[PDB]
């Protein structure tokens, strides 16, 4: 991204008050400069010995304060929805960003790049409820045999427990707190920190680790002034 | 065409067909001057006295 060397914060705000956008856009970029940098570029233009000139390239947003959403999916036994990713509401329609790279999240505020996004009707939201939504052909992934897995979402996880496999969800304090019968269960990241699915262990919550410290002591500069005894000498 | 049109609005979302030229920034630097002070001993006045 655009380093704090290439563009200071004073100068970024200097450029933001000059962008042809609305007070509502100007205010969103001032409060997510981290993301705006990760989305900006810096291209070296004219390099002379005694003066360097580069071109910064900031992002401009088309729409703001749209309601967005993100889709994770898991096998159903066997179905597996394959329209996974970020959905946002464009004007009238819905823009759909399928690669997890092009969309940045901070707090509760998503920033997506529209360069390769798909535009879908608002009726795809009806696919989550019924796979045979007659108002849209939900792209699905099928299979003639039992499958089992988990998929860790933003705020929890999904456990596809099917067949003779043995899946469970542990809690850090209480250990195993639920066994899973054959079905699609959803587990909250509040109660559960681990979900075992067979022989593979999924981690629903990040695991806190050792805290490291590197101590530094102030360095003392010392010198020794060289003083001559003139008074005893100016007497002799 | 990106010749005639620089913007296209579609509803409530604004697309930018052409890049928006911006403010030009400059960071000026002035030459740094090294200075020292040569130490000359009055030997001629000393070699006479």
């Amino acid at each position, epitope marked *: 991204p655009v380093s704090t060397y290439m563009l200071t914060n004073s100068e970024l705000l200097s450029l*933001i008050n*000059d962008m042809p*956008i609305t*007070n509502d856009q100007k*205010k969103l*970029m001032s409060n997510n400069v981290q993301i705006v940098r990760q989305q900006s570029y810096s291209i070296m233009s004219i390099i002379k010995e005694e003066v360097l000139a580069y071109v910064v390239q900031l992002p401009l947003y088309g729409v703001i304060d749209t309601p967005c959403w993100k889709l994770h999916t898991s096998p159903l036994c066997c179905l597996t929805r394959t329209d996974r990713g970020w959905y946002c509401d464009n004007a009238g329609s819905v823009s759909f960003f399928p690669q997890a790279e092009t969309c940045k999240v901070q707090s509760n505020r998503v920033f997506c790049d529209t360069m390769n996004s798909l535009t879908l009707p608002s009726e795809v939201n009806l696919c989550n409820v019924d796979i045979f939504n007659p108002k849209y052909d939900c792209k699905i992934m099928t299979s003639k045999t039992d499958v089992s897995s988990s998929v860790i979402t933003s705020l929890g996880a999904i456990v596809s427990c099917y067949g003779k496999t043995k899946c469970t969800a542990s809690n850090k304090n209480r250990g195993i707190i639920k066994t899973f019968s054959n079905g699609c269960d959803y587990v909250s990241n509040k109660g559960v920190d681990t979900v075992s699915v067979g022989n593979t262990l999924y981690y629903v919550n990040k695991q806190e680790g050792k805290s490291l410290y590197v101590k530094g002591e102030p360095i003392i500069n010392f010198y020794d002034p060289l003083v001559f005894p003139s008074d005893e000498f100016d007497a002799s | 065409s990106n010749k005639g049109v620089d913007t296209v609005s579609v509803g409530n979302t604004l697309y930018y067909v052409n890049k928006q030229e911006g403010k030009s920034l400059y960071v000026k630097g002035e030459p740094i001057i090294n200075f020292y002070d040569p130490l000359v001993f009055p030997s001629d006045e000393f070699d006479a006295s």
Partner: antibody
Amino acid sequence: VESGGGLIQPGGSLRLSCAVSGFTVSSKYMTWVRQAPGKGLEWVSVIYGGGSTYYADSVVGRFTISRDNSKNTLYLQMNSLRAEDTAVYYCASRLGVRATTGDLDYWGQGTLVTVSS
Amino acid sequence: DIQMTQSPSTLSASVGDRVTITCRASQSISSWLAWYQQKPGKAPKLLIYDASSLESGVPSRFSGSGSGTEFTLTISSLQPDDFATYYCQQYNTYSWWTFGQGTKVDIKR
């Protein structure tokens, strides 16, 4: 602080000049507000740090906002003045620093422009 | 474009009173409403910006509140300092700034 206002016959031209001291004009957006006799405040024209200029509907095409880095003074060329343009023209900018756009806390003295035969 | 409308036309109040001027927006302007003081024959004086942040160095007796379409300017303890005309300003975008029509204030004494 302004100058260059005054009376000019309808259809004539007039040149305002906004003397600004304390800060550089080439790093902040500058604005023009006019005020009719006994009416409210009406925004007129604005120039941002990067040269973008915008004029309200009432005056667009007939006015021309510009600045010169040398004399550190933003102007406001007013061509084809009619009776309704007669008002007192204030210039303003924002001394302090933030990233929102619109408030003002330096305003000039205020110069009268009268259009009459 | 947006238009701002205040009430009333002229508001009378004595020294030390609590005065409340309102300013309404034809569109939700988020949090960008500025208040201005104009003593007759003078330049506008900035009291409040961004709905709620008070400009540093202006008496703390002035206060603002609200966001969206319903905004209010409230003075806690009135002074002879303040008797003048008050203006509200929307700045929801770059291109189009529009002012209030003004609330002119007199006294009882």
